[PDB]
Amino acid sequence: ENLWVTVYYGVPVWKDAETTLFCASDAKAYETKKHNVWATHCCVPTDPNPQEIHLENVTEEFNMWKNNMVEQMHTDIISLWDQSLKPCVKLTPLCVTLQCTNVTNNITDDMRGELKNCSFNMTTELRDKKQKVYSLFYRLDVVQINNKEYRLINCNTSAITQACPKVSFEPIPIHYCAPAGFAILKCKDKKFNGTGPCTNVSTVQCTHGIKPVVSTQLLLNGSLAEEEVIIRSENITNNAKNILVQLNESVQINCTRPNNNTRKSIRIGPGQWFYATGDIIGDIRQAHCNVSKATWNETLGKVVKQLRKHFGNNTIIRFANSSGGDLEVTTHSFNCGGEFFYCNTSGLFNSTWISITLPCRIKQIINMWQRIGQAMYAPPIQGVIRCVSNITGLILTRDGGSTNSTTETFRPGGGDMRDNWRSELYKYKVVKIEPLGVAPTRCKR
Amino acid sequence: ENLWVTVYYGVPVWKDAETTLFCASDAKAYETKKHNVWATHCCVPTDPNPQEIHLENVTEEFNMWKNNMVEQMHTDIISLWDQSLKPCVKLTPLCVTLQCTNVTNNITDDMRGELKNCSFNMTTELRDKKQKVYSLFYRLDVVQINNKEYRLINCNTSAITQACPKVSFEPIPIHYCAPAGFAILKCKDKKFNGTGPCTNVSTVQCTHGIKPVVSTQLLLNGSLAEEEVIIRSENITNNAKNILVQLNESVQINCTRPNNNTRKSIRIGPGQWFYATGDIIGDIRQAHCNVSKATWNETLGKVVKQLRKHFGNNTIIRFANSSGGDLEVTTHSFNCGGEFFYCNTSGLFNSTWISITLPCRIKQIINMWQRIGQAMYAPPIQGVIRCVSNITGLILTRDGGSTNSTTETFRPGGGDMRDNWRSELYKYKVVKIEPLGVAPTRCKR
Amino acid sequence: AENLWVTVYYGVPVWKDAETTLFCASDAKAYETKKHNVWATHCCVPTDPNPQEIHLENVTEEFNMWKNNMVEQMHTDIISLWDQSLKPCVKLTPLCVTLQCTNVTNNITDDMRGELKNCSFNMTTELRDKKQKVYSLFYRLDVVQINNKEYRLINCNTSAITQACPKVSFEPIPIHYCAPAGFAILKCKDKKFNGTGPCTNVSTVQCTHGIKPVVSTQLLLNGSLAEEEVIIRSENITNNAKNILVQLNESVQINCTRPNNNTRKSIRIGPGQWFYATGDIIGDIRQAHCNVSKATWNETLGKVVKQLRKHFGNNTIIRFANSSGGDLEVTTHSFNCGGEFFYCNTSGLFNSTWISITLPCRIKQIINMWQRIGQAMYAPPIQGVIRCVSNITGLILTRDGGSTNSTTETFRPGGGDMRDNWRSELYKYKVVKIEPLGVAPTRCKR
Amino acid sequence: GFLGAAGSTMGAASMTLTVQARNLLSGIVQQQSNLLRAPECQQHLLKLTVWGIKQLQARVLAVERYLRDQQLLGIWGCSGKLICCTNVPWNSTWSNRNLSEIWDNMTWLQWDKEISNYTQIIYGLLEESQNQQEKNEQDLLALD
Amino acid sequence: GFLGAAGSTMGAASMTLTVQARNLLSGIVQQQSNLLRAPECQQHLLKLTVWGIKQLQARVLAVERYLRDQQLLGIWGCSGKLICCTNVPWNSTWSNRNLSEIWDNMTWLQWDKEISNYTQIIYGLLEESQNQQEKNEQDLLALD
Amino acid sequence: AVGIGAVFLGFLGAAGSTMGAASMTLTVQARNLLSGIVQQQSNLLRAPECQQHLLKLTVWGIKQLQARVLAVERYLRDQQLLGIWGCSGKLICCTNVPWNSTWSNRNLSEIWDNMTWLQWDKEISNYTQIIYGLLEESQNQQEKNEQDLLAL
Numbered sequence A, B: 001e002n003l004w005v006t007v008y009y010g011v012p013v014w015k016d017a018e019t020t021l022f023c024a025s026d027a028k029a030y031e032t033k034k035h036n037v038w039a040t041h042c043c044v045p046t047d048p049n050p051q052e053i054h055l056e057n058v059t060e061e062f063n064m065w066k067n068n069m070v071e072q073m074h075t076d077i078i079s080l081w082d083q084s085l086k087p088c089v090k091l092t093p094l095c096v097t098l099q100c101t102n103v104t105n106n107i108t109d110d111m112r113g114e115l116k117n118c119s120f121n122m123t124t125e126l127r128d129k130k131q132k133v134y135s136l137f138y139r140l141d142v143v144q145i146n147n148k149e150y151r152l153i154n155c156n157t158s159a160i161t162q163a164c165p166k167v168s169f170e171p172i173p174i175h176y177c178a179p180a181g182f183a184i185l186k187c188k189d190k191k192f193n194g195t196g197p198c199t200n201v202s203t204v205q206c207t208h209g210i211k212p213v214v215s216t217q218l219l220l221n222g223s224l225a226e227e228e229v230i231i232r233s234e235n236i237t238n239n240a241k242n243i244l245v246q247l248n249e250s251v252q253i254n255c256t257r258p259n260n261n262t263r264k265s266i267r268i269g270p271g272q273w274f275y276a277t278g279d280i281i282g283d284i285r286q287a288h289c290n291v292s293k294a295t296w297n298e299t300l301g302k303v304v305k306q307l308r309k310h311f312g313n314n315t316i317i318r319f320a321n322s323s324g325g326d327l328e329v330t331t332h333s334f335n336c337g338g339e340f341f342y343c344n345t346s347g348l349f350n351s352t353w354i355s356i357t358l359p360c361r362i363k364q365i366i367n368m369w370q371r372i373g374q375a376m377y378a379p380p381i382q383g384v385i386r387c388v389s390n391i392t393g394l395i396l397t398r399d400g401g402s403t404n405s406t407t408e409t410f411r412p413g414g415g416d417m418r419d420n421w422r423s424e425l426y427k428y429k430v431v432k433i434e435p436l437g438v439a440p441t442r443c444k445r
Numbered sequence C: 001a002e003n004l005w006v007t008v009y010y011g012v013p014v015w016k017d018a019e020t021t022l023f024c025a026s027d028a029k030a031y032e033t034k035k036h037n038v039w040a041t042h043c044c045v046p047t048d049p050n051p052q053e054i055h056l057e058n059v060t061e062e063f064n065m066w067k068n069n070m071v072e073q074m075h076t077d078i079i080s081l082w083d084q085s086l087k088p089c090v091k092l093t094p095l096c097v098t099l100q101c102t103n104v105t106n107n108i109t110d111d112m113r114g115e116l117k118n119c120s121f122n123m124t125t126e127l128r129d130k131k132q133k134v135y136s137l138f139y140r141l142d143v144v145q146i147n148n149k150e151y152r153l154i155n156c157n158t159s160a161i162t163q164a165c166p167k168v169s170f171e172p173i174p175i176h177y178c179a180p181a182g183f184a185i186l187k188c189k190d191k192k193f194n195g196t197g198p199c200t201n202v203s204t205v206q207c208t209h210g211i212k213p214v215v216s217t218q219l220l221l222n223g224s225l226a227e228e229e230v231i232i233r234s235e236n237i238t239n240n241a242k243n244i245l246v247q248l249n250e251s252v253q254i255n256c257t258r259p260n261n262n263t264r265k266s267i268r269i270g271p272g273q274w275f276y277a278t279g280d281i282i283g284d285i286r287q288a289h290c291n292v293s294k295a296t297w298n299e300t301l302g303k304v305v306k307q308l309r310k311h312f313g314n315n316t317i318i319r320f321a322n323s324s325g326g327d328l329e330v331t332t333h334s335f336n337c338g339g340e341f342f343y344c345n346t347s348g349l350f351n352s353t354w355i356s357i358t359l360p361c362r363i364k365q366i367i368n369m370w371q372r373i374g375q376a377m378y379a380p381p382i383q384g385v386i387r388c389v390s391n392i393t394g395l396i397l398t399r400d401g402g403s404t405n406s407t408t409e410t411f412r413p414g415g416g417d418m419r420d421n422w423r424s425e426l427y428k429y430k431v432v433k434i435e436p437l438g439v440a441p442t443r444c445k446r
Numbered sequence D, E: 001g002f003l004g005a006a007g008s009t010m011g012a013a014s015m016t017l018t019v020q021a022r023n024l025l026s027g028i029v030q031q032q033s034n035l036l037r038a039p040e041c042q043q044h045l046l047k048l049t050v051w052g053i054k055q056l057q058a059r060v061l062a063v064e065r066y067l068r069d070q071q072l073l074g075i076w077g078c079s080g081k082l083i084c085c086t087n088v089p090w091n092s093t094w095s096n097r098n099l100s101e102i103w104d105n106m107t108w109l110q111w112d113k114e115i116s117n118y119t120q121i122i123y124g125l126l127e128e129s130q131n132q133q134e135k136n137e138q139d140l141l142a143l144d
Numbered sequence F: 001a002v003g004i005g006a007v008f009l010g011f012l013g014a015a016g017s018t019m020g021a022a023s024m025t026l027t028v029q030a031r032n033l034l035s036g037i038v039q040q041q042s043n044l045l046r047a048p049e050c051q052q053h054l055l056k057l058t059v060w061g062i063k064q065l066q067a068r069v070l071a072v073e074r075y076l077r078d079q080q081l082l083g084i085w086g087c088s089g090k091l092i093c094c095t096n097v098p099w100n101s102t103w104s105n106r107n108l109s110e111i112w113d114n115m116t117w118l119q120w121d122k123e124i125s126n127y128t129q130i131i132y133g134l135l136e137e138s139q140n141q142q143e144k145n146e147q148d149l150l151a152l
C-alpha cells in the first residue's frame, strides 16, 4: 500500500553480452623469451593471485556451442600468426625448376623415396649472378613436372613466406580478461555437459591460462576431467556433429625425429637469407610416436562405457581409423619442436567393444588455418627432436547410416580449430553488468 | 527592472558546423553482395523508417557551393575505390614489347583499325619458364614504339593494377547520417536554386539515398525537379563557373556493346591471374548509345527557356560540341556493365534556338580520378553488354569569350566530380547543436 | 576534541612528475609555401602566434636533463618522421649489379686522386624486356671491389637502398613541443643552470621554444647559447664513460663548401620510377672543405679549459686530442649541408695542450642513418655548388680516463647517439601532470 | 568482491552498492595505466593496428555507457545518489506482491527478470515528473 | 520532436529541453548498438584504418564537448538541473527588451543571435557568483 | 609590498602562494583539464590540410587518440569520487570525517598561512588512501539515514 518507485544504482545484476577481451600472460613466466609469438604479443601481465568470488545461490545457463569467446580466440590466434610472419623473407625467388634425385645414403627401407636431393639455380645479391645450390626436401613438399624435374608444391597456388628463424611458437598459457563493465562467470559443476544450467557459479577477473595448442584428432596438453571421462556434443543423435571427449587421466605420448639435421644458410638477396636443410648426419630413420598400450586400452574402455550410457547397454561399439581427405585432417598433427609431424593414428582406433608405434611424416610447407593462398615454410630445426606430451582428449565423429543402429562406429575427426578451443572455454561465459535498477519502497520525496 | 540570469540546458539552437558523417546503406539491399564495394564498406543499417521533423517558422540559409558534405563524399569515394583495388593482382609483368597486327575478321567499317591483336612473352608460375600468349586490346590502351611493336600506354607513367574480377562497382544508394550531437537540415522548397534562404525546412537524421554514379557531361540516375527545369550556378554571370541543370522529366538513354567477347585466364605467377580478352565470337560492331530524338529536342527546349530567363529574351542561344582536351572530359563517360564507355555527344548539342545515335569507344586502362600516378585495368566482361539509364541533368559551360550581340553559346563541360555530388547534396546542410543559453527571468536563488 | 574536519578541494595547483606524449607543432607561416619538407609536412599543427609564459614566483623544482623523457620522445619521433618520408619513394633495387668502374682522372687535384670513380652498368628500362647501359659517378666510399674493375654498391651484402624523394627538403625548421591538456611544461630560467638539481625562477609554458632538429656528430650546430659563461654539463664529470657536452656562451662560424659544379642525370628505371645519377662535373675537381677562424677557435677553446679545470684543479693539464675509433659516423663531424652528406676531419681543431683552419671533408651518398643497418638511404645528387655557413654552439667531448693518475688528462672529441644533441636543447624543460584533487583540515562540518 | 552480493537478498545487497559503481571507471584507469607497466608492451602493441582500434572502441564505449546512465539519473533528479526516492507511485501491474517478498528473501537477479519490459514505462514517467518539479521550483523562487 | 521547437517562442520551447538534452548521448550509444545487427562489417571496417580513426575521433570529441558543458554547469552551481536560477542580475545593456518580448514573440535562435557578444561576460559573472557562495557556506558551517 | 591582493598571473600562478591564498584560483585549475582539450582540437580546424595529413600516420593518430581517451577517463574517475563522497558539483566541500592529528599535527594558522599546496601534499601523502576510504564510509551512512527519514 502506497509504495513509491525508487532508483538504485550499483545493483549487482547482468545480461549475456559480447565484448573484446584482453590477452594477458604471466610476465615472469616468459623468462626472457620475447621471441615467443605468444608472449611478445600478450605482453600485458596478469595480476598475481587472480581472485574468484563464489556466488552462493546463483544459477546460470552456459552454452559452449554458442560461446563467442571461442570465435574471438580463433580470430585472434590467426591474426597474431599472420602478424608474426609479416616482417620476414619471402621465398618467391625459390619457385624455380628443381633437378631432383633420391636420397639413398644409409637409409632404411621404411623411408625409401621419402627424401629427395634437389639442386637448383637461385639468385644472389647481385642481380647479374646466379648460384647453384641444393637442399633435401621431404617428398610431401615436392611435385613432379610432367622424372627429374620437380617444383615446390605451392608454385601454382600460393606465395610462400619463410617463417622467422628466431620466432618460437611454443604455447604458453594465455588468460582472457574482461574489460571493466564486464565479468566472466565460471561454471565449476562437476560432470557439466556444456549446455545445461550450472549450479556452482563463481565470478572471475580472467580465465585460467589456456595453452593455444594446435592439433587434430587428439587434443594435447589440455585440462582433465576430475570425476570420469566426460562426453560432450551439441547433438548426440545427429551424426554430423563432432563429439568432444575429455579424459579424466592423461595418456602419455613420446614422439621423435631421430635424424640429425645440419642446417644450411643460403644468401638469396640483399639482406635476405633462406634456410635450407643441408644434409643428414648418420642413418636415416622414420619419425614416430609411442603410446603405452595398456594405458590406451584402459582409456578406450572408459570412453566406451560413457558412450554406452548414451547409445545402449547391448550396443556394440567399434572404433575405426579416419576417412580419406586432406592430410591435415586424416592424420594427427603436432607442431612440436618446430617441426610439423603428421602421424598415422590407425593403430589407436582398431577395436570392437562389447607400446603402440605410430609412424609419422614431416612436411615443411604448410597451411595451418585451412586458408588457401598463404603458405608458410618452416625453416629446418637442427639436431634430434624429442617431445613428450599429454593426451587429454579426443575428437570423434560417428558414421551414422547403419541399418537400424545395430552397431555404432566412431572415428577420429576434428580439424576445425574452434573445437580445440571449445574444449577449454566451455566453463566460461561473458556478461555485461547493468547497474541501474528500479524497486518499490516505503518512502516519498 | 528586477531580473536575473537564468541558465537553460537543452535549448533548441544550432550553428553551422563541419563534422564527419558516416555512411549507411539499406540492410536488405546487402543481400549476399559482400563483393560489392558499396555494400561491403557501408553495411551499417539505416533506419527502416527515416524521420522528418518539419520546422514551422524556420528560415535557414543554405549554400551548396560551399558545403562540406560534398567534399566529404568526394574524399570518401576516392578512398573506398583505392582500398578495393589494393589486394589485387599487379600487372607490372605485362609491360613488355607487344607484337601487334590489326583484327580484320568480319569488321564493319565503323571499327576498322579500332581493335588490335597482340602477342607477347609473359612470365609464368616458375621463374625459369616463359609462355607466349595473346590478347586483344583497344587502340587507346596501346601505343606504338617508334613498326609492329607496341607497349601499353601506362608503361612510362605508372604501375597498373587489375581490378579484382569478383568486385562490383555497381552503384548502391547510400545515405549520409549525422553523428549524435549534429543534425542535418533539409530544404523542401520547390524551385530552390541554391545560395539563399529556404522557407520550408526539416530535420532528418540521414540524407535520401544517393547513388554514387561516376560520370561526366550528362548526369545519370539522379533526382528530378518537381515542377520546372532548374538552373543552378555559383555565379550565372561568370563564364568560369559550371552551370548545373536539373531536369523535371527524364530522357532515357539505351547503351550497348554488341560484341560477344570471351574472357581467358592466364596464370602469371603463383596465386596470380591475368584476365585477358580472347577472340570475339560474332561480327565486330561499334559500341553506341541511343537517345530518342523527339524527347531530347523537347527537353532541350525547356532548358533554353530557363536560360532565356537569366539571359536576354532576344538572345540567340546556341549549343555546340565540347572544346578539345582529354577524352575523359571531351566525351560523355560512364561505367555500363562494368566496362568503360566514352561517347561522342556532338549529336546532342548541335542547334540554334530563337532516334539519335551516339558512337562510343571502349577503353580498358582507366585513370578514373584524374590522378597521374595511378591506373587501373578493367578485366574484360564476357558476353554482350546492355544497360538503360535515366538522364537527369546536364553540366554546361557558357563559352563566353565576351561574344557580342547576345549569341550565347553553351557547350558540355564537366570533369570536376564534385559537381555530380552537388546535384544531390544541394538541399542538405550540417549543423551542430549547442544546448546552453541564458535569458532573463524574475527568479532568484 | 580539537574539532577539525576534513575538507575536500578541487582545483588545487599541484603536480607530479609524469611521462606523456607531447605533440609536435610548427609556425603557421613556417610553411612558407614549402610543403615538401620533412618537418613541416608532418609537424603541421600551427602554433599560437602569441605564446605566453607564466612566471611562478616562489617555486623551486628539481630538474634532471639526464632522465628527461622529452628527449626520448624526440629520438623516437625523428626516426619515425625519417622512415615515413622515405616510404613512398623509389627502391633502387635494380642498381645492385656488377659495375665496371675506372678512376676519374680528368682535371683532378692531387687531394682528389682516387676519390671519384666513373662506373658503367646494365639496368632496367620502362619495359621489362629492355636493358640500358648507363653510367654515373660515385664517391669511392660507397663502392667496393668485388675480389680491379668490378665493383658493387657497398650495401648489396646488407640491405636495400631506397632513394630519397628529390623534392623533399630535410632542412631543419624550429619545432615546438606542446603539452596535452592536464599537463604542463616547467621551464628552468637559472642563467647558470648546471643540470641535475633544484632550480629557482621556474616558469610554466604551454610549448617549448622552437628547436631546430639539426643532426651532427661532434660539433653542435645552430643551437642556443649560454648567456654568461661557458657551461660544462655532464651526468657524472668523473666517469670517463660519460660525455662532457660543453655549451658555449658565444657562437663561432664554420664556412662549408662542396666546390665542384655537378649536374644530375635523370634515368627512367621502370613504370613511374626514376633514378638520379651524378653526371659529369663541370670545371675541375676539388675536395669539399670547411673553414673556421684560428684565433676565434683558440679563444673559445681556452674558455672551455678555464671552466673544465673547475672540476679537475688549477695545476692540472688539459690536453685536447683528435679522437679515435669506429667508422666515420663517430670519427668525423657529420652535418648534411645543403642536403649532401659531409664527413669532415676535425683533427685540426683538437691539437693543443693547455697549462684560418681548414678541415678537409669527404662526401658520401649512401647513408645509414641513426646507427642502424637494416635500411640505407641514397642521397640524390645536388646540382650546382653547395655552400653554407653554420653557427657552432657546442661540443661533445669525452675524457679518456686517467692512466697512472698523472697530471694530464685528455679530452677527445666524442660522438654518440642522437640523444645527446637533444639533451643539449631540452635541458631546460620538464613535464608534469596536474592533480587538482586534495585534502586539508578546516573548522567546518555538515 | 565485485559481484559478491549477487546471491544476497535485495535489501542486503543494497548495503554495498558503492563497489559496483566504482568498478565501472576505476577498473578502466587501472587496467590501462597501472597494469600496463612494461613500456615495451605499448610500443609493440601499437604495431597491431587492429588490436589498437578494437581496444579503443571498447574503452570509448565503456565511457559512453557510463555517461548515458549518469545523464539519465541527472534527468530524473537522482544525481549524486546511489539511493534515490521519487514521486512516481508504484503500479501493481509492474509487480503485485508484498514489500516483504520483494525486498527480502529474493535476489536482484530475480527481480530484474520479473520487471522485464515494464522498465521503459517507468523511465518515461520519471522524466516527466522531474520536469514538473523543476518548473515548480522556478516559479516559487520568483515570488519573494 | 527533436528540434521541433525551433520555431516556438522561447517560453513554449522550454518544455522540450529534455528532448534535446538526451540526444547528445543517447544517439551515440544507439548508433553503436545498431551495427550489432550486421556484425560482418564490424569486422570489415576495422581494415579501413582511416575510417577507424576518424570514427573514434568523432565519438571522442562528442564526449569531450558534452563533458565540457557539464563541467561548466557544475562550476556555476547548476549541476543536475535543466533549469537553474542564479544571483547574477540581468544587465539592460545585454538586452533591453521586456519579458513580454523575450519569452513570447521571439524564438531561441533569434535570442541567441541577439545577445551573442555578451556570452563570455555572462559566463564569467556566473563563475564569480558561485565562488562567493561556496566560500560563504564554508564559513557558515565553521560557526557550529 | 606583498600579500595584498589575490591576483595571480595565469594558470599556475598560485603555485607558490600559500594554501589559503590559492583557494582563490580553484576555478582556474579546474576548467583547464577539460576545456584545454576541446580548444586544442578546435585549433586543428585552422589547418584542414594538417588534419588530412595526420590521418596518414597510423601510429601518431592512435597515440594521440589514446591520450585523449585516457585524459577523459582520469577526469571522470575524479568526478566519480566527488560523487561518492557527497561533494559532487562543488569546488569546496566540508565533510563529516574528523581530522586525525596522526595524519598531520599542525595548527590551522600554520597550515593555511605558511604552507603551500606543493608542500602540503607531500606531508600528508601517506594518508591519502586512508582519508578517501573514510570519506566513502561517511557518505554511505548518510544516504541510508536519509531514506529512513523519508520513510517515516
Ligand SMILES: *[C@@H]1O[C@H](CO)[C@@H](O[C@@H]2O[C@H](CO)[C@@H](O[C@@H]3O[C@H](CO[C@H]4O[C@H](CO)[C@@H](O)[C@H](O)[C@@H]4O)[C@@H](O)[C@H](O[C@H]4O[C@H](CO)[C@@H](O)[C@H](O)[C@@H]4O[C@H]4O[C@H](CO)[C@@H](O)[C@H](O)[C@@H]4O)[C@@H]3O)[C@H](O)[C@H]2NC(C)=O)[C@H](O)[C@H]1NC(C)=O
Pocket (backbone or CB within 6 Å): C034, C169, C171, C172, C214, C215, C221, C222, C335, C336, C337, C338, C339, C382, C383, C384, C387, C388, C389, C390, C391
Ligand atoms: C645553420 O643555419 C644556416 C642559416 O639558416 C643554414 O644555412 C642555410 O642553408 C639553406 C639550405 O641549404 C640555404 O638555402 C638555399 O640557398 C641556395 C642558394 O642560392 C642563392 O643563389 C640563387 C641564384 O643562383 C638565389 O635565387 C637564392 O635566393 C640564393 O641567393 C638556394 O638555391 C636554395 O633554394 C633551393 O632549395 C630550396 C630547398 O627548400 C627550394 O625551396 C628552392 O626552391 C630551391 O630549389 C630549386 O633549385 C635547386 C637548385 O637549382 C634545384 O635542385 C631544386 O630541384 C629546385 O628546382 C636554398 O634557398 C641558405 O642559403 C643557407 N644560408 C647560409 C647563411 O648559409 C645551415 O645549413 C644550418 N646548418 C645546419 C647543419 O643545419
Ligand SMILES: *[C@@H]1O[C@H](CO)[C@@H](O[C@@H]2O[C@H](CO)[C@@H](O[C@@H]3O[C@H](CO[C@H]4O[C@H](CO)[C@@H](O)[C@H](O)[C@@H]4O)[C@@H](O)[C@H](O[C@H]4O[C@H](CO)[C@@H](O)[C@H](O)[C@@H]4O)[C@@H]3O)[C@H](O)[C@H]2NC(C)=O)[C@H](O)[C@H]1NC(C)=O
Pocket (backbone or CB within 6 Å): A167, A168, A170, A171, A213, A220, A221, A334, A335, A336, A337, A338, A386, A387, A388, A389, A390
Ligand atoms: C606439451 O608440454 C610439453 C612440456 O611439458 C612440451 O614439451 C617441451 O617442448 C619444448 C619446446 O619444444 C622443449 O624445449 C627444448 O628443449 C631442448 C632440450 O635440449 C637439451 O639438451 C641439449 C643438448 O645439447 C642442451 O643444449 C639443452 O640446453 C637442453 O638441456 C632445447 O635444446 C631447446 O632449446 C633450443 O631450441 C629452441 C627452439 O625454440 C631455441 O630457442 C633455443 O635457443 C635452443 O636452440 C628447447 O629448450 C622441452 O624440452 C619439451 N619437454 C618435454 C618433456 O618434451 C610439448 O611440446 C607440449 N606439446 C605440444 C604438442 O605442444
Ligand SMILES: *[C@@H]1O[C@H](CO)[C@@H](O[C@@H]2O[C@H](CO)[C@@H](O[C@@H]3O[C@H](CO[C@H]4O[C@H](CO)[C@@H](O)[C@H](O)[C@@H]4O)[C@@H](O)[C@H](O[C@H]4O[C@H](CO)[C@@H](O)[C@H](O)[C@@H]4O)[C@@H]3O)[C@H](O)[C@H]2NC(C)=O)[C@H](O)[C@H]1NC(C)=O
Pocket (backbone or CB within 6 Å): B168, B170, B171, B213, B215, B220, B221, B334, B335, B336, B337, B338, B386, B387, B388, B389, B390
Ligand atoms: C542507371 O540505373 C539502371 C537501372 O538500375 C542501371 O542499369 C542496370 O545495370 C545493372 C548492372 O550493370 C544490370 O544488371 C545485370 O543484368 C544482367 C542481365 O540479367 C538478366 O537475367 C537475370 C537472371 O539471371 C534477371 O534477374 C535480370 O533482371 C535480367 O533479365 C546480369 O547478367 C548481370 O549479372 C552479372 O554481372 C554482375 C555485375 O558484374 C555480377 O555480380 C553477376 O554475378 C553476373 O556476372 C547483372 O545483374 C541491369 O540489368 C541494368 N538494368 C537494365 C534495365 O538494363 C544503369 O547501369 C545505371 N546507370 C549508371 C551510369 O550507373
Ligand SMILES: *[C@@H]1O[C@H](CO)[C@@H](O)[C@H](O)[C@H]1NC(C)=O
Pocket (backbone or CB within 6 Å): B193, B194, B195, B196, B197, B231, B232, B233, B234, B235, B236
Ligand atoms: C538564386 O536565388 C537567389 C534568391 O533565392 C538569388 O539571390 C540568386 O541571384 C539566384 N541565382 C543563383 C544562381 O544563385
Ligand SMILES: *[C@@H]1O[C@H](CO)[C@@H](O)[C@H](O)[C@H]1NC(C)=O
Pocket (backbone or CB within 6 Å): C194, C195, C196, C197, C234, C235, C236, C237, C238
Ligand atoms: C653539476 O653537475 C655535476 C655532474 O658532474 C654534479 O655532480 C653537481 O652536483 C652539479 N651541481 C649542482 C650545483 O647541482
Ligand SMILES: *[C@@H]1O[C@H](CO)[C@@H](O)[C@H](O)[C@H]1NC(C)=O
Pocket (backbone or CB within 6 Å): C106, C107, C281, C282, C283, C284
Ligand atoms: C679539363 O682539362 C682540360 C685540359 O686537358 C681543359 O681543357 C678543360 O677545360 C678542363 N675541364 C673543364 C670542363 O674546364
Ligand SMILES: *[C@@H]1O[C@H](CO)[C@@H](O)[C@H](O)[C@H]1NC(C)=O
Pocket (backbone or CB within 6 Å): D113, D114, D115, D116, D117, D118
Ligand atoms: C513482458 O515480461 C513478462 C514477464 O513475466 C512476459 O510474460 C511477457 O510476455 C513480456 N511481454 C512481451 C511483449 O514480451
Ligand SMILES: *[C@@H]1O[C@H](CO)[C@@H](O)[C@H](O)[C@H]1NC(C)=O
Pocket (backbone or CB within 6 Å): B056, B057, E004, E005, E006, E007, E008, E009
Ligand atoms: C508560427 O507562427 C504562428 C503565428 O500565428 C503561431 O501560431 C505558431 O505557433 C508558430 N509556430 C511555432 C512552431 O510555434
